[PDB]
Paper text:
Interleukin 4 (IL-4) is a pleiotropic cytokine that plays a major regulatory role in the immune system. Signal transduction of IL-4 is mediated by a sequential binding process, initiated first by binding of IL-4 to its high-affinity single membrane spanning receptor chain IL-4Rα. This intermediate ligand receptor complex then recruits one of two possible low-affinity receptor subunits, the common gamma chain (γc) or the IL-13Rα1 chain, into the functional hetero-trimeric complex to initiate signalling. The overall structure of IL-4 comprises the known four-helical bundle in up-up-down-down topology, which like the crystal packing is unaffected by these mutations.
Author numbering: 1 to 129
The structure:
Amino acid sequence: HKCDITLQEIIKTLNSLTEQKTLCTELTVTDIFAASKNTTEKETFCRAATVLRQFYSHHEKDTRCLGATAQQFHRHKQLIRFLKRLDRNLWGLAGLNSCPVKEANQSTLENFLERLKTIMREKYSKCSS
């Protein structure tokens, strides 16, 4: 289970996510990576999933994010769809919902997604030859 292709699903989705920016992607999320890091792999996944669920829940219909143009609206819908897809995969990996996140620091969603991508690529690297 630890080295399941779900890791590839998460990475591919993070790649799609980090290739769009926006007013939306500068809005913030609680920075689970600001911890001094006393945390199981499963607890990290639950944490990341929780904050991302907070984000897409809060901003799916946010007027700052919805967009004026057809293109901006499309990219918003794509962001929300990909955040849900990423979240679905993260919860599947976590096998958990009870993971309080206590961090004060907020980071932009963009910065949080890049950090998560780094962590996930490292996991992938640690799984393969």
